[model samples]
Target chain A: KASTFRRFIEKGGEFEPEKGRYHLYVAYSCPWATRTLIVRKIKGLEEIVGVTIVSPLFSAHGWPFGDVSPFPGAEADPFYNAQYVRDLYLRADPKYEGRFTVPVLWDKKTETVVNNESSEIIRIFNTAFNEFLPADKAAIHLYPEALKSEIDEINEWVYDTVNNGVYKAGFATTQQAYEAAVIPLFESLDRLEKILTGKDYLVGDQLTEADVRLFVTIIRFDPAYVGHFKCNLRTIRDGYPAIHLWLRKLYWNNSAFSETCKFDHIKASYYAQKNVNPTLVVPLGPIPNILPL
Target chain B: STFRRFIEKGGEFEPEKGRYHLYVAYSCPWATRTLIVRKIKGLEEIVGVTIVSPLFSAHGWPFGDVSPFPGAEADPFYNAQYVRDLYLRADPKYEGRFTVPVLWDKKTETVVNNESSEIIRIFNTAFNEFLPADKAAIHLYPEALKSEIDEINEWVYDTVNNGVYKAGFATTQQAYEAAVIPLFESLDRLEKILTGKDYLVGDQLTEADVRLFVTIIRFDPAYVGHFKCNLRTIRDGYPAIHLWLRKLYWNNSAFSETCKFDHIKASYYAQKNVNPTLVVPLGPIPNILPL
Candidate 1:
């Protein structure tokens, strides 16, 4: 609902999954944008649909990139060399005035945006292009129909209270607003801790949408959220062990998950790029950014 | 060695009850060490203190209606608004930087010592004669452990002790890294030493424990985010160091009372150029809990 841009709706929508037809744009530092990257990799779409990388930073004007950048394992927008991501959004609507966000799935054939909505993009990435993908990759579904009701219930709170909760807490300008945001965040984390204790993933033995949604927040919790956003009553490593073990599984043991994270890019954006940290000194500890599986 | 003027029984600033008043700030780590000694040695009765606010003003630590903290006791010696006034009062031509804890001699009307390490030593033995044998028996600088305490102290002082300040105060990125890296290396070393033991140096508490205590306690509350000394926090990264910090902090009233979380948090967040927002972080709380 918060997505102000045009909708790219479904697998059968105008943004159909065709080999070499659609491209995903992302800022490695942003969690919403990061979700699509994980989904893209997990679906084994790397060779089929291309991806663009934006600079972790936003200049005063707005996001600048070719959809892909020169950063490691990254690329540029094949068509437009727009230095600003806002330029692409501006070119599309001409009258659009929403925040320039990431995880934009652009359609090369249509020469327009397929979807800037990450949740939708990830869902489309799951089944839309399975026709061209290998059986192993195609069979891997993050949002299985078997657990749709339960996944929907988990996604609702995790996204509201845990996913956006950190931003609500970190970006809060007042102490009252901060307190209101933080209390629910830890409460949500505490609930997840109990839920993930004896289970391998959020839903069942298999990974699902709930796991993907919560993973991004935990990965950045200590390095970025704790210091930058001041969501630090406690760090994920010390306060939440169940969550960390699950994170280490995805971070160290999985190539699709591990390959996508860039700490240098992540740290630089939040510390130097964002106005929150005036000292601009990045904390170097919690040594191994992620623990061993 | 630089400011090694001792105040023994027959020394220049001889042992006399009610002879000295200490000017200290709970915010200043060096100042905190002196307060720790005065309390642990049971010298609170012999010497009196004029507590200064945490914030360091243009005129240095202020002394009046500005002591926003609940127990931020004022300077009772003179009608001085700034601690600098007292420094000038000691020597009108004083050329050195004005810092605390300043040990003022009431009779001589001069500064006895400004060095925290020396001031704590003076408190260690100067009033031993006046104290009851049991009270005076609390010796932090025993002759046998002096060399060991001094050696451990030297390294802790170079790295962990003064290391945090260097990291936070550095104006450049390179300089901040230079200070912060050494700070954590020293903390890791201490964490190893404390793995099976209860203290830093000897079996029981000593000057070495007190020296390291002042910095570790402040690591999370101020240094971690406030100072950008983010290599690792005492609580999260080092298990032994975290245990040591909590034990010493909750040791007793003498230790806990001497440590003021409010002053430490408020001053760092409100300082002129440091943390301009003065948005005091509500963190590392349950500030100190059971090990």
Candidate 2:
């Protein structure tokens, strides 16, 4: 099933925008969660909405709020003292069924989840709290009217081939299954490399939802995806020149891109994927995960 | 136990045509050294060869029809199944790791040398009496450059040749990082050394080049991903090392013919000790890019 909590916070919606009433639960290790985390940081929503990060490592109960001292940004659940993210899911509905994923938008007043889908959560963050924000922060819009169609179109292909493509390739049990997912993953990267030649963002001069969606995957490419997911036909740093330059530009220039990115969390989490890495001994690199601009 | 017997001009194990055999695996870098030396020294006719399979079983390297992998031939000499069988033939109670590049003496029915470094030196000159002057003229370990070749070989062997193994087989992250740092540092040092030159030591190819070439040839293919020696790549990061590799791999058949990317990839990834999943990586693809 898809994200059960799809309700949005709007002007006159059931979940109204209020400071200190909403909390964003995330994990830096996750690309989906990182997408929300980046938008929240970029849009200056950190003060308007409180956020908590779970441990980078996953367990049988799924995303956990375990000991957070090892990972810097990760914090324990302050509300319920919950051991796992699933506890928050159970709190939302007495009998909730499905995977307990991060980037959870929790309504503290109602003691329920407003949204779990990262794409929607970021959209909710984009403009829902405009009245409470300053003119400069409120003026920023990721899904601008002129580029919404283009962003949507790019998001569709990039999500399937790049976002979940790494998972499909790594989680594959057979060679045919792996190649099926991996070939298109690199093929899409090739297309992106070509499109990114002399261009700054995916659509135009300004950043969009397309860049945010793709950035999460690309940031983890050389560090986690290349080695852990066996997406090693090429590397962003070595093979894709245009893509690498674009990546460096985003990371170095944008504080949201760089600050929200945690390479240690990304590497530790992916390498902890027991099915893919049975030894649980993380590989020590394509060192300096990202190079200097 | 290792067979360390050497061959001299009037020695018991004399250099003669069709009187000796070489056993090898295309996957092994150490064994590849001997194959390169044998080819460069023109000893194919003098010494025949049998190849073992790429994947190692619990028993060890075996000889069989691991098809699609051409040249993994059955043991024609003794009709043996395992490379260990040949070791037993040399020493019945031999209690050592069954390794390849076994230089066996057909006349004496014993192994002359199983060490690739020693075997390459043996092939460098022992069979030269039977070869033509042009073939005999190629001296990898020249009289004047012997010390230089030996000097380079010492560090390169430890840090580069065996470094990949140290990283790949390591059970801890600390151990892997320790081996990987020196490996790339050595690669960086070599990249500088070969910046304005083709070979490692002197003007021409030497034992230094061969010893280093065997490891370098396998670096991008096997070590980079399988061994996690990925601080940099020979293809992208080290331009000089890559050019040097291109010259050796493309200019000479001795190096090119002996290199089997399939076998090299399979041997490293399929080993359960390192890769429990046993799924070989698809690439650094096209194995090595064109010249």
Candidate 3:
């Protein structure tokens, strides 16, 4: 059975943007959570939607509040001080049986989870909180109605073949599974690079939700996925120059990309994989991501 | 006698002209320590030396023109093809790993010692009789801090010197984690210990520091990546340790001359069973610089 694609579509898909009414739990290591961090920062929702950072290392049970406190950066869950992310999932549906995923959009007023999927959470930030934000901050629309169709279409291909393709490639159990996932990943990358050849962003020559979705994966490709995930046919810097330039622009020009990136966490967690990095020794070169090129 | 007691009882071999020959491989840390001691003690002319090839095969150390076998002719002492031949020569029925840094008594035509820790001491004081009075003044294993030096040597050997091998060669997950965690833990402890001190045991440079230097200098390049000791790189992970490494490599001639990057790269990555492609990485560039 397909999992429910629940959303607050009417009022930013039910978790309407309000002052101090929602919280973001994230880790610099997670690309999925990083998308939410980028969106929250771009939308100038720092004060409106407070964020708590979890430890980069995840436990077998998934993201934890760590030993210091139950809710990480939020002290405890502001609404109920729940111990784990699953507690929030359980609170949403008493008999819920699904994986406890992240980029959670919690409704502090209703004391419930507004959304868990990163795509929906970022979309919520893209438009829902304009009334609470400064007029200048509110003008940034990642999903303007006029571009929604093109943006959504771009997102579908990008998400399937590029954004989530890396994970598909890395987690695949067989050579066929890996080749199927990796080929499409680079193919999508080839298409995106061609699309971005003359323009600065992924769609309609402007920054959009599509660009945000794609950037999260591209940024980590060389440093994490290429070696750790065995997506080593080529590196982003060596193979995809246009996408590399786009990523660098995002990283160098914007605070969101820089603040959300944690190279040590990203390198260590992946290289520490026993099956992959059997020696467990992390390589220390490749200093300072931005190069002259 | 235990290995330590035997060395202490044997004392420094009396240095004489053409008395001892040192066998070393520029690549081996254990062997390199003895070479460093020989240079620092200014014993180059007093002691004859032979260098072994850096590459090792399944039978172990292979001697070529580079590392001619011990004798007047420079041919291998034995007609046998491997280093184990020398070990068998020393004890006709010897059965053990034939390691380097062997000290030979030219007068006796017998292996004086094979252990690196022991050989370093022999280089430190054994040849003093043949040296000028001023040149003979160098003392690495002073009596005052013998116990402290022993303590430091124990941990440094377990966690740093051999810690890297344990992490690199670990066949199982439990073994790798077991070795790498303590390796970093010991490094962290050493960094804290080195906070205000110049050498490990005390203000005076000692054998303990020399042992640690060989490992620290290679941590970032070989051990950090090839060995799978990836918790952190020594350069970024330990500030004091990194500084100590730079000081030894830059300030000392013995270190720079004896340290060979090409040998290190070829030896570790050339093993088909380990790195099948044998593609030597070009990096962790600018190995070291002026302090």
Q: Candidate 2 falls in which docking quality class?
A: medium
The C-alpha stretches of model 2 lying farther than 4 A from their native spots are A66-69, B66-68
lDDT of the structure predicted as candidate 2:
0.86
User: On residues B10-90, what C-alpha lDDT tens digit does candidate 1 reach at each position?
Assistant: 678888889888888887789899999998988887988988877677777887456556667667767777788888887
TM-score of chain B of each: 0.95, 0.97, 0.88
Encode model 3's per-residue lDDT on A1-293: one tens digit a residue: 22243566345345554678877766667788889999888989898898866555555666655443332233344456566666777887777777777667776677666777887788878767888889988999888899999998988988888877887877675557877888888778788889888678888788888888888888887677765565644557756788889989888888877777777767755665554454555544344444443
What is residue A189's positional error in candidate 2, in angstroms?
Answer: 1.0
lDDT of 2 by residue, B137-213 (tens): 99898899999898889889999998988988787888988898898899989989999899888789998999999
lDDT of 1 at B245: 78
Candidate 2 vs 3: which has more DockQ = 2
Predicted candidate 3 versus true structure: per-residue lDDT over B1-291, tens digit per residue: 011211233454444667677766666788889888888888889877766666667777776553343321222444545666666766777666787777766665557788888888877766677788876898888899889999989989998899989877876667877888788889989999887677888687789989998888776666655676655556655778877778778787877877877666656755554444344444354455447
Q: Can you tell me which runs of candidate 1 are displaced by over 4 Å?
A: A9-13, A66-75, B1-12, B92-95, B107-109, B202-204, B272-274
